[PDB]
Amino acid sequence: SCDLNATNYIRGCQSKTYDGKIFPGKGGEKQWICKDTIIHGDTNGACIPPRTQNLCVGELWDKSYGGRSNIKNDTKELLKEKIKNAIHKETELLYEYHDTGTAIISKNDPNGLPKGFCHAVQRSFIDYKNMILGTSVNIYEHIGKLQEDIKKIIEKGTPQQSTENVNAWWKGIEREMWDAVRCAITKINKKNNNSIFNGDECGVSPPTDQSVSWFKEWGEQFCIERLRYEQNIREACTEKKCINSDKIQGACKRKCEKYKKYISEKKQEWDKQKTKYENKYVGKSASDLLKENYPECISANFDFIFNDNIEYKTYYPYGDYSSICSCE
């Protein structure tokens, strides 16, 4: 059983801001961080999710006075405890972030939990795994210190045979770490009238390549945002207000230009991730990866949307939404 009514909050992990502050707060959103001269998985490149940049490290890190590792002298038991509490806090804060409709991917499916909450929780859990295993990305010098203290805690505190021990140690604690997620979900009962929550709603077992996991998150987000853009285009162009010359005008042209602008910024992110994915996973499509996972991606022709031919800019000014964004 879990720590049902036993409350525990940790300093350093406040309400999420990665897709923006929770209302009435505004802005403060993080962007996807793509880097050239970095290795992720086997190969070059990486795009870092806003959510990852907001990951709760709890008592693992001491932010006070310029920053320091809070696990330098820890036993592996106390380290495990500190990870478990961080994971438990991450789950609670992600629940609030998707319950309030602030997370982009939440803007109520199907076990009665907030849309996107389980995906986000699974994703953060994968991030914790890769942080502990030392197999993520070296973007933060402070997490570099964390994987390295973790490595030395495990090696001093287990019999030698070596990040092979760090790998076996994670495997031995994985079930317990996942129980921190299930436990935090059970505590939703205290909070929620939609259903009864047994804690298994985001999976009885932990999920399920972090680079692929990050790319999938990118996709889910892009496709949802894409449908919101369509929604606003149809509300402002559908009304058939076209100025004589007929060329679109006013609210319609505004909403259409917003999507055109959105696609232009997302293009670099698609190219980077698509290339990394497809030339690591030979014979596999980046388009298939997203479409087989997220129903919001089904209407998206990724090759059309991000097409780099010369004629496409002139004939399709607003991409795949050019027809709604035209006259007649």
Side-chain angles (χ1 to χ4, degrees), residues 89-100:
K89 190 55 172 276
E90 180 75 2
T91 308
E92 304 214 322
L93 297 169
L94 286 176
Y95 173 84
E96 178 192 57
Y97 207 55
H98 296 78
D99 188 56
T100 63

Side-chain angles (χ1 to χ4, degrees), residues 1 108 114 138 143 153 199:
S1 37
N108 212 283
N138 72 331
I143 73 157
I153 293 171

Side-chain angles (χ1 to χ4, degrees), residues 100-257:
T100 63
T102 316
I104 293 163
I105 69 168
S106 76
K107 288 188 180 164
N108 212 283
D109 290 342
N111 280 293
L113 283 173
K115 193 207 194 321
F117 161 75
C118 286
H119 292 170
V121 160
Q122 290 151 3
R123 287 162 183 153
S124 286
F125 193 84
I126 289 163
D127 288 345
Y128 286 115
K129 175 184 189 282
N130 289 91
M131 177 188 293
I132 293 154
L133 262 33
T135 51
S136 51
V137 120
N138 72 331
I139 189 74
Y140 297 110
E141 213 87 326
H142 83 272
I143 73 157
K145 282 200 199 169
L146 253 34
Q147 331 192 319
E148 213 65 66
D149 276 343
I150 285 165
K151 179 175 149 60
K152 215 72 150 199
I153 293 171
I154 299 323
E155 292 178 337
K156 177 173 176 161
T158 61
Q160 203 185 18
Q161 39 66 276
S162 195
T163 40
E164 310 197 336
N165 269 25
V166 173
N167 301 326
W169 184 77
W170 167 259
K171 275 171 177 169
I173 66 156
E174 184 184 47
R175 290 291 179 184
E176 193 175 333
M177 299 307 95
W178 191 254
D179 291 349
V181 172
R182 308 207 284 161
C183 172
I185 294 168
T186 285
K187 286 161 78 160
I188 290 165
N189 285 131
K190 290 151 195 69
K191 247 143 145 225
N192 198 302
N193 60 305
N194 265 242
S195 197
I196 306 291
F197 301 111
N198 49 62
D200 297 332
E201 288 74 23
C202 306
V204 315
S205 287
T208 15
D209 206 317
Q210 190 190 37
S211 85
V212 169
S213 170
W214 285 5
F215 191 15
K216 279 166 74 173
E217 178 168 17
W218 184 95
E220 186 180 31
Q221 184 191 327
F222 166 81
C223 293
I224 286 181
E225 291 193 285
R226 179 188 166 263
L227 295 183
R228 292 176 62 78
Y229 279 104
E230 181 174 18
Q231 186 185 299
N232 303 328
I233 282 167
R234 292 186 188 273
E235 284 165 39
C237 310
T238 270
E239 185 162 341
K240 201 199 153 195
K241 292 166 184 298
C242 273
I243 284 303
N244 293 245
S245 292
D246 318 54
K247 261 70 198 171
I248 63 168
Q249 164 269 354
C252 180
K253 189 184 183 178
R254 267 206 194 253
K255 294 308 188 294
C256 293
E257 280 174 309

Side-chain angles (χ1 to χ4, degrees), residues 17-20 29-34 47-53 97-98 102-107 115-116 119-120 123 212-230 259 262-263 265-266 269-270 273 289-291 293-298 300 302 305-306 321:
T17 58
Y18 60 85
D19 295 337
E29 75 274 2
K30 301 181 183 290
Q31 62 175 55
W32 287 78
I33 298 175
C34 306
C47 294
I48 312 159
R51 185 202 38 75
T52 308
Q53 300 162 53
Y97 207 55
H98 296 78
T102 316
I104 293 163
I105 69 168
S106 76
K107 288 188 180 164
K115 193 207 194 321
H119 292 170
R123 287 162 183 153
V212 169
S213 170
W214 285 5
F215 191 15
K216 279 166 74 173
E217 178 168 17
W218 184 95
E220 186 180 31
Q221 184 191 327
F222 166 81
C223 293
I224 286 181
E225 291 193 285
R226 179 188 166 263
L227 295 183
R228 292 176 62 78
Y229 279 104
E230 181 174 18
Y259 183 67
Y262 177 68
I263 300 307
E265 291 158 14
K266 300 303 275 177
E269 292 167 13
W270 166 259
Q273 292 170 110
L289 177 66
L290 305 180
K291 291 194 187 221
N293 284 289
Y294 313 104
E296 298 93 342
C297 290
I298 298 178
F302 291 103
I305 291 159
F306 297 110
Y321 295 145

